[PDB]
Amino acid sequence: GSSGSSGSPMANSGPLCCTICHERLEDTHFVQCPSVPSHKFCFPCSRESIKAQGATGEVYCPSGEKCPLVGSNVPWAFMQGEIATILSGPSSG
Ligand SMILES: [Zn+2]
Ligand SMILES: [Zn+2]
């Protein structure tokens, strides 16, 4: 299917997929809502939300629903730690 530098480096394969891309997920690594099973945002999906919402501040669900933490009555906000792990590049050169 889709093979080459231009486009997805993989073909339409896999049971689970992203919610924003709706194509495929490299691996579980993708950011999955701790409350919403359907919500499936990969690395190149959460970041955009981390900056839009608050790169240095809090970052709610990349969907814009502010889904609360499973069991807990508080929204999950990426921590400085992950914020960088997913970003993989703070500089926008
Ligand atoms: Zn995605
Ligand atoms: Zn969510």
Q: Please list the strands of the largest sheet in the order they lie side by side.
A: 1-2
Derived structural class: mainly alpha
Quote the CATH topology of one domain: Arc Repressor Mutant, subunit A
Q: What percentage of amino acids are in beta strands?
A: under 5%
Question: For the record, what CATH class of one domain applies?
Answer: Mainly Alpha
What molecules are bound to this protein? zinc ion
The separation of the N and C termini measures: 32 Å
Q: Percentage of helical residues?
A: 10-25%
Give the overall shape.
Answer: globular
- What value does the Rg take, in angstroms? 14 Å
Named at the architecture level, the CATH assignment of one domain is Orthogonal Bundle
Largest sheet: 2 strands, antiparallel
List keywords for this structure.
22% helix, binds zinc ion, Probable E3 ubiquitin-protein ligase IRF2BPL, globular, two-stranded antiparallel sheet, mainly alpha, Arc Repressor Mutant, subunit A, 93 residues
Q: What does this molecule look like?
A:
- The chain is mainly α and about 90 residues long.
- It has a domain at about 30-90: Interferon regulatory factor 2-binding protein (Arc Repressor Mutant, subunit A), CATH 1.10.10.1580.
- It contains two helices and two strands; from the N terminus they run ββαα.
- It has a two-stranded antiparallel ribbon.
- Strand 1 (about 30) and strand 2 form a beta hairpin.
- One zinc ion binds next to helix 1.
- The PDB classes it as translation.
- The entry lists the keywords Protein C14orf4, My039 protein, Structural Genomics, nppsfa, translation.
- The assembly is monomeric.
- The entry is titled "Solution structure of the zf-C3HC4 domain of human KIAA1865".
